[PDB]
Enzyme design. Structure first.
Site, PDB file in Angstrom:
ATOM      1  N   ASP A 118      35.258  11.668  22.528  1.00  0.00           N
ATOM      2  CA  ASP A 118      34.929  11.743  21.081  1.00  0.00           C
ATOM      3  C   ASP A 118      34.749  10.341  20.518  1.00  0.00           C
ATOM      4  O   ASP A 118      35.225  10.089  19.424  1.00  0.00           O
ATOM      5  CB  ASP A 118      35.975  12.570  20.325  1.00  0.00           C
ATOM      6  CG  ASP A 118      35.510  13.041  18.954  1.00  0.00           C
ATOM      7  OD1 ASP A 118      34.280  13.211  18.784  1.00  0.00           O
ATOM      8  OD2 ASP A 118      36.390  13.138  18.034  1.00  0.00           O
ATOM      9  N   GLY A 128      42.115  15.684   8.294  1.00  0.00           N
ATOM     10  CA  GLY A 128      41.233  16.185   9.363  1.00  0.00           C
ATOM     11  C   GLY A 128      41.574  17.621   9.709  1.00  0.00           C
ATOM     12  O   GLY A 128      42.490  18.209   9.079  1.00  0.00           O
TER      13      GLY A 128
END
Ligand code: RKW
Length: 337
Positions: A147, A28
């Site tokens: 998120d 990520g």
């Protein structure tokens, strides 16, 4: 001293005569997650390696603080959050050791060829996620995840329905404004698109979008950009209430006030279904055998079941963050009876 921000991690190496690195789970912006055997405790662990980058280290220290804060509560409700076992510095990176989990709800969707999971499995995910959001709403926590998406919700076990929420790296507490942009675009609440104040209700918006996607196999609102995002929301839910748009710093990014004081969509530069005409009743296929009619002639997919599911979703997708259903009330919904 290394030049890249990423830790070099060699499959098969052993850290601190303890952690046997098996494989990369995922990479990520934050850094990486590796599958490792903890030889001391004799168990699998997911090690979250933070990049040697100030922004990501700041995010990770907030995620450590919030996870440790959640750790000190006794309630069973806390086990819907991924358990942080420990953290340490290693080769100059912050490393968070988590309990090993299975694949995420997006992977689960891909394994259905994006046809969606049963309404019965959707209900199970919905109850656990409403229970988790109830936990974050504990006043001494008051944590906004900021998120929520299929990728940040993971199965505990590949053959079972138990789920956990991961990634509090973008998270904040009630009353904070830290990051210019928050929420993944598809799951981004109207209040955030409109530049308005945000509280725990933005996570319930994200959950509503996620639960429709888990049953249909497709994102409810798949915006290419913020203007497209808002327009796709409007297709389903109509023009937002005047009392919201009149207070919204970014109302004029998407809408225009007419001389009567009524709001319409802003002109395109120079395509969408008219406001409110893409009915959730038809997206779900309440009267028509569910998504694409594929659920007609299965059990657990009655009109009665679909109407309860749609009613709960539309309470989760309320434009008004003050009246949007809260976790405490969502759990009492007849969908969970
Ligand atoms: C790519 N999305 C970011 C991401 O993976 N974040 C993340 C991941 C995990 C985590 C925990 C257990 C796990 O078992 C298998 C994968 C995995 C990931 C935990 C936390 N706090 N954050």
């Amino acid at each position: 001293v290394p030049r890249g921000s990423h830790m070099i991690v060699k499959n098969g190496e052993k850290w601190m005569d303890r952690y046997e690195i098996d494989s990369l789970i995922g990479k990520g912006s934050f850094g990486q997650v590796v599958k490792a055997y903890d030889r001391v405790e004799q168990e699998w662990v997911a090690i979250k390696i933070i990049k040697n980058k100030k922004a990501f280290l700041n995010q990770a220290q907030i995620e450590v603080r919030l996870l440790e804060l959640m750790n000190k509560h006794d309630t069973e409700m806390k086990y819907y959050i991924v358990h942080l076992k420990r953290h340490f510095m290693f080769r100059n990176h912050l490393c968070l050791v988590f309990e090993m989990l299975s694949y995420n709800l997006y992977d689960l969707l891909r394994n259905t060829n994006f046809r969606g999971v049963s309404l019965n499995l959707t209900r199970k995910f919905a109850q656990q996620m409403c229970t988790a959001l109830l936990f974050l709403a504990t006043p001494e926590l008051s944590i906004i995840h900021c998120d929520l998406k299929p990728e940040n919700i993971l199965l505990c076990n590949p053959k079972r329905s138990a789920i956990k929420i991961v990634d509090f790296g973008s998270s904040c507490q009630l009353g904070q404004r830290i990051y210019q942009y928050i929420q993944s675009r598809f799951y981004r609440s109207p209040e955030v698109l409109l530049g308005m104040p945000y509280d725990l209700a933005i996570d319930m918006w994200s959950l509503g979008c996620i639960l429709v996607e888990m049953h249909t196999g497709e994102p409810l609102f798949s915006g290419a950009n913020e203007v497209d995002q808002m327009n796709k929301i409007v297709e389903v839910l109509g023009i937002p209430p005047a009392h919201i748009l009149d207070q919204a710093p970014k109302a004029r990014k998407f809408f225009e006030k007419l001389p009567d004081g009524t709001w319409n969509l802003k002109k395109t530069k120079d395509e969408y279904k008219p406001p409110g005409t893409r009915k959730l009743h038809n997206i779900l296929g309440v009267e028509t055998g569910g998504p694409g009619g594929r659920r007609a002639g299965e059990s657990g997919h009655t009109v009665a079941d679909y109407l309860k599911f749609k009613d709960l979703i539309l309470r989760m997708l309320d434009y008004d963050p003050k009246t949007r259903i809260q976790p405490y009330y969502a759990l009492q919904h007849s969908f969970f009876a």
